[PDB]
């Protein structure tokens, strides 16, 4: 397939005999790739679970939002710590989580019951799901929990841990409400004190070793990996390779794994725009994470080929048609010229022909006019003369 232009019309139609006609084909084949890895300046030594431990576990009605900023974080250790009972990660793979970067990590520590991490999930039912700690439906992050019966309990349990089960409205996502207000359930008002049909809406947990597993203590840290339009402050162990420009390889830039040819750019950004998009929301240009240099992505391995041929009944001499490539030694770069020989004859040499339909190299150009037997496009026609 990867030897002649005739040899790759012969693969796109799955027949060893072609006919006479213009044959729009497929891939230009071979294209050797390697890898480019670029990920920024980093602070190192990160607040892991080794600062999210020991004593002072945060309250379930009074948690905080631990602002983890610039660090490198090996996320494989937190998966392979082998002490945590439930991971369920939301659009992110837990195993290959270390091959990504984010702008910040939002950890939220609180202790709940044993039947409630089926409710700490996006869009769940129940009271303490929607009245105590709400998650968005399009959440991009994990949930981490484990039994803490021998650490989060005393004799008779803690009266410091208070879930809220009554509130007039449901919570917004990630919302905190640290109020200690009495709520009213019935006709007789409360007005700051208790009494008939007044319920105290915070509720103390019962933490005993004789108590049930579904009410056992169970701290939950929820890691929100959000992706803003800031530079990536938090990353993982992605040791960095160089920056080779042109020669199409697979790459990864701030977690955006793609494959393309890397060129210098003429394009202007903002202070913190790491990614430039497209009309149909793909990738056109990426800010380099290290040197803050503009780059440009374009696909390789294609030009617009339509091999014209007189058929294999006549001869094996063919000619090509690139579509928007204007052949001023540009399909040295369009057709990425690292292919095997007996293609480079039909790329740049003699028999260069400029047409509105793009360039046709490998055939004659004749100042006379004749008939059409193999139509090409934009007012030209070839044939086969002996």
């Amino acid at each position, epitope marked *: 397939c990867a030897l002649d232009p005739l040899s790759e019309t012969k693969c796109t139609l799955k027949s060893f005999t072609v006919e006479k006609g213009i044959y729009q084909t497929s891939n230009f084949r071979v294209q050797p790739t390697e890898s480019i890895v670029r990920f920024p300046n980093i602070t190192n030594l990160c607040p892991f679970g080794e600062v999210f431990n020991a004593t002072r576990f945060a309250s379930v009605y009074a948690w905080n939002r631990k602002r983890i900023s610039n660090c490198v974080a090996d996320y494989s250790v937190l998966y392979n710590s082998a002490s945590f009972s439930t991971f369920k990660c939301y659009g992110v793979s837990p195993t290959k989580l270390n091959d990504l970067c984010f702008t910040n990590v939002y950890a939220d520590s609180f202790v709940i019951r044993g039947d409630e991490v089926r409710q700490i999930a996006p869009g769940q039912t129940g009271k303490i799901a929607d009245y105590n700690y709400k998650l968005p439906d399009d959440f991009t992050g994990c949930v981490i929990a484990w039994n803490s019966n021998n650490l989060d309990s005393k004799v008779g349990g803690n009266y410091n841990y208070l879930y809220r089960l009554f509130r007039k409205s449901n919570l917004k996502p990630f919302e905190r409400d640290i109020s200690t207000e009495i709520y009213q359930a019935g006709s007789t008002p409360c007005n700051g004190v208790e009494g008939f049909n007044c319920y105290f809406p915070l509720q103390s947990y019962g933490f005993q070793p004789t108590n049930g597993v579904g009410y056992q203590p169970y701290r939950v840290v929820v890691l929100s990996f959000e992706l803003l339009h800031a530079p990536a402050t938090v990353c993982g162990p992605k040791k960095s390779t160089n920056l080779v420009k042109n020669k199409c390889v697979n790459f990864n830039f701030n977690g955006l794994t793609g494959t393309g040819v890397l060129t210098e750019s003429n394009k*202007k950004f*903002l*202070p913190f725009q790491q990614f*430039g*998009r497209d009309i149909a929301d793909t990738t*056109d240009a990426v800010r380099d994470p290290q040197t*803050l240099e*503009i780059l440009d992505i374009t696909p390789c391995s294609f030009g617009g080929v339509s091999v014209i041929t007189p058929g294999t009944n006549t001869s094996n001499q063919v000619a090509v048609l690139y579509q928007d490539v204007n052949c001023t030694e540009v399909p040295v770069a369009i057709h990425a010229d690292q292919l095997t020989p007996t293609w480079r004859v039909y790329s740049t040499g003699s028999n260069v022909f400029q047409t509105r339909a793009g360039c046709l190299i490998g055939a004659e150009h004749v100042n006379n006019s004749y008939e059409c037997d193999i139509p090409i496009g934009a007012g030209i026609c070839a044939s086969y003369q002996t």
Partner: antibody, heavy 124, light 109 residues
Framework: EVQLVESGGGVVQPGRSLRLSCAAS????????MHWVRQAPGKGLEWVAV????????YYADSVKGRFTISRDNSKNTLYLQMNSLRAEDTAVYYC??????????????????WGQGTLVTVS | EIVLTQSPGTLSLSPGERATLSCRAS???????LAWYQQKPGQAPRLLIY???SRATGIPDRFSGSGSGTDFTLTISRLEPEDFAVYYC??????????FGQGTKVEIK
């Protein structure tokens, strides 16, 4: 030459809607980022908004966010600023500006190379 | 959030000498991500200094600015009559925001 010809001014009653247009010529409009820039009479000048070359990266100012919105269309080389619910303190001259970035090895410099001609928008 | 402060609000000097304008921030502005502009009165602003040190195209060497940290200056020696306009300091790095100062108009004494 480069031209950022803009239009959309006049006298508009409060609470109505408007759509300022910054047409561009002389360069590639999808190669550069875009800026909306405003000036009250008798004061200094107050920044409004920024959108990128593609539209995926928008930012607005603190007294701007919500009502004002920004968009672009690259096929006609035009920048769009859409006005919802106008208030009498928004009597200002509006300007479209482009962001040209002189790169260096020690950083990344930022400036406003080319501007519009100013469109007066009065809210009364 | 960086607010930008200038002093004075309007300066009046005779033509031919040096004109001194000052700009002041709220934080430590890193690597001078600011610029200086000329709003001719009634007209659009026109860029003079970029990076608080380097002149633009069509902009002579009589305008010269410098600064670091917080206090930022502009010095215009030999005052031609086309140089009397309103000048600004304008940040754009550090935050995603763009913030202006209140500026100074240069007049005739």
């Amino acid at each position: 030459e480069v031209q950022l010809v803009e239009s959309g001014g006049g006298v508009v009653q409060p609470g109505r809607s408007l759509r300022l247009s910054c047409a561009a010529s002389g360069f590639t409009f999808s190669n550069y980022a875009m800026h909306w820039v405003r000036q009250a009479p008798g004061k200094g000048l107050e920044w409004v908004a920024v959108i990128s070359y593609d539209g995926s990266n928008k930012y607005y100012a603190d007294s701007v966010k919500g009502r004002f919105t920004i968009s672009r269309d690259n096929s006609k080389n035009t920048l769009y600023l859409q006005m919802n619910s106008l208030r009498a303190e928004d009597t200002a001259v509006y300007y479209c500006a482009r962001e040209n970035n002189y790169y260096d090895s020690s950083g990344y410099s930022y400036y406003f190379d080319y501007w519009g001609q100013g469109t007066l928008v009065t809210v009364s | 959030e960086i607010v930008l402060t200038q002093s004075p609000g309007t300066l009046s000097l005779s033509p031919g000498e040096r004109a001194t304008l000052s700009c002041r921030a709220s934080q430590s502005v890193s690597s001078s991500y600011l610029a200086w502009y000329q709003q001719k009165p009634g007209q659009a602003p026109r860029l003079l200094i970029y990076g608080a040190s380097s002149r633009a195209t069509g902009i002579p060497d009589r305008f010269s600015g410098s600064g670091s940290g917080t206090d930022f200056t502009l010095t215009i020696s030999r005052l031609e009559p086309e140089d009397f306009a309103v000048y600004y300091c304008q940040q754009y790095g550090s935050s995603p925001m763009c913030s202006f100062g209140q500026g100074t108009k240069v007049e005739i004494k």
